[PDB]
């Protein structure tokens, strides 16, 4: 087909290819941030007056600021 | 044919040829401006008070001012 046609088709083709490629990149960058909490040490402490409190040690697995909902 | 005829025919022929040639040029110049958006980084952010906002990085593919319709 005429070079005009190859011009049009290559333009649209390149736009679509770049879009999909950097879509893959962004999906990878979002999947790499999957995170979660893990505990390495926990011993509930109790005082003489009845006050209790948990003294735990956390380590965030991943690269993010995990949000604690409830204990 | 008589040079009168060749004069007439070459005039009309040259007009038509120039018209079609610069038609091809203008079609190429219009096809070269095919454009589109592409994203390279996107991470939705959320505040403590519930306000959310997307912080994306855009790069226009092509040579034009793309118009965003909806997200």
UniProtKB/TrEMBL annotation, chains A, B:
The chain crosses the membrane at residues 5-25. Keywords: Membrane, Transmembrane, Transmembrane helix. The keyword Membrane applies. This is Class III signal peptide-containing protein. It comes from Pyrobaculum arsenaticum (strain DSM 13514 / JCM 11321 / PZ6).
